[PDB]
Write a protein that binds this ligand. Structure first.
Ligand code: NA
Ligand code: NA
Lengths: 318, 316
């Protein structure tokens, strides 16, 4: 008898509600101003990654914790509408759904206040129920928007079952636990996160190569430093010379969430196209992220398989 | 079949309060982590309506929210407080109104209001409510929806003999003078009075002088509220200012206390029309002073059963 594929991509990480007010000018202390418009959106790195992987066709499972509040109820509905398993999406009355409140002016300058909230209450017991699902997956994906101890335990669970680990140390912290390096099959961050992690400055592809080598020697198997619109730089234990995977300048409409589109695409390729070279996967993941920058609205900008070139889902070199 | 006739009609605003607590206020380009977030139901219109309802008024909230979660939840909030939502409209054309607040530990804040769907409440929307308005005792308006809409609600009320209670909040320096001539009772606070009149108001006496400027612009009754100091009242027939005190209470959270006063006053005007204005304002001051002893805006507004029975008695 036929049955559905089990989840090949498991994401253990965050959900946040984006609360966006547009204004003419940014307020300062003591001020009340009237803005033009307000936007709510579904964000959080974990969920964003998961939504991009799902839309490419991955079978995914989101392990996370939201509030027993309207925001959390709505986030669950969002995951379902994107065909994501919520078997291990947990709700707690002990905190509100995490929030990223943003005030932004017409130039796109902003003030942002994050309250991690229920994300920080995702614990070991919560993960242990997912041990079997994790053990049958192809890729585990973590960031640093939940308790770091909880991400460390999810990478540990994956690694003990032979499951590929994709770790996005974002947002980055200067004293990152060095177990994260050892436990990461693929360690992927952006320029400013690389600076935080290494103490070096990173303003070009060459700089990112130097920073990537520092991280590699701390115990990573593959290090990728993303360069926003400019592509990425990659090195590995097998090929420690840095390689810049460049891109063509596209006209950006809204880049919010593009980093997570890149990560979620890389997760999809790692799980479903394991015989592609890493270089080929990064090329394709760069292209997909670049699709997301041509439309507004973060998750709403993430492309579906059916709208993307057929060749992204076929062999190219073999 | 057994209509409940609403005695108090509020035509005004609903807003969702979105509050993040932080160590410090962020400035341009900065991202910070705060330590708590919470949501509340606000908007001066709804606040006022809520308080009047909890005193036992049959109320109807004429307002517009989004077809979004905030709006659906606001509607439920109104129903839980026993408020008619017959003319609570929902629109896809904008989001429910929002007040996004960032507050540090010292209590200093940054606030961004998006009026949103509140501005889309138009004169056609009110015309469907003509019959409800015409059977009410009191009509209550503020300045958080389009002014033209409030003006038309005051006009409709006045055409049917319905008492008009107008709260010019937040205040604007060049307020349309029609608002004075359409108001049976005009109620604002000290800093709103300053904005309206160009005068300084730091004491009950100063408020009396400001209240007289507003009275002469065409109001019938003017009340200037003074927070813990009570209020000052004047009228066309008794133009001498009268200071109505409030007995001292320990404040826990004063947010919404002005709306509590105004919603109480609406209740008394509708259900206790033979009480002297002085006795109404005594009782309304007490009620608002109850609200300041608890946190959470609408969640602080007392019910009838939490108050002394004498607030709901009347001599011959
Ligand atoms: Na985008
Ligand atoms: Na209060």
């Amino acid at each position: 008898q036929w049955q559905e594929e089990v989840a090949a991509v498991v994401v253990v990480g965050s959900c946040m509600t984006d609360l966006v007010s547009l204004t003419s000018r940014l307020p300062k202390t003591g001020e009340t101003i009237h803005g033009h418009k307000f936007f709510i959106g579904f964000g959080g790195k974990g969920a964003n990654q998961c939504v991009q992987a799902a839309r490419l066709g991955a079978m995914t499972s989101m392990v996370c914790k939201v509030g027993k509040d309207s925001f959390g109820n709505d986030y669950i509905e969002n995951l379902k509408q994107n065909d994501i398993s919520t078997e291990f999406t947990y709700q707690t009355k002990d905190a509100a759904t995490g929030t990223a409140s943003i005030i932004v002016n017409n130039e796109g300058q902003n003030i942002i206040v994050i309250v991690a909230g229920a994300n920080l209450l995702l614990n070991t017991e919560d993960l242990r129920a997912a041990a079997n699902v994790i053990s049958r997956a192809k890729v585990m994906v973590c960031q640093l928007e939940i308790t770091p101890a909880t991400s460390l335990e999810a990478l540990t669970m994956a690694r003990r079952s032979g499951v590929k680990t994709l770790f996005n140390p974002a947002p980055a912290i200067a004293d990152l636990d060095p177990q994260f390096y050892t436990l990461s099959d693929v360690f992927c961050c952006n320029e400013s996160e690389a600076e935080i992690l290494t103490g070096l400055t990173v303003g070009s592809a060459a700089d990112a190569g130097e920073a990537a080598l520092v991280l590699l020697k701390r115990g990573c198997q593959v290090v990728i430093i993303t360069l926003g619109a400019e592509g990425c730089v990659v090195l590995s234990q097998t090929e420690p010379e840095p390689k810049h995977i460049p891109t063509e300048k596209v006209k950006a409409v809204d880049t919010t969430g593009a980093g997570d589109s890149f990560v979620g695409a890389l997760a999809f390729y790692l799980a479903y196209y394991p015989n592609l070279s890493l270089e080929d996967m990064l090329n394709r993941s760069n292209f997909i992220a670049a699709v997301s920058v041509q439309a507004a609205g973060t998750q709403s900008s993430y492309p579906y398989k059916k709208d993307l070139p057929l060749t992204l889902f076929l062999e190219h070199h073999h």
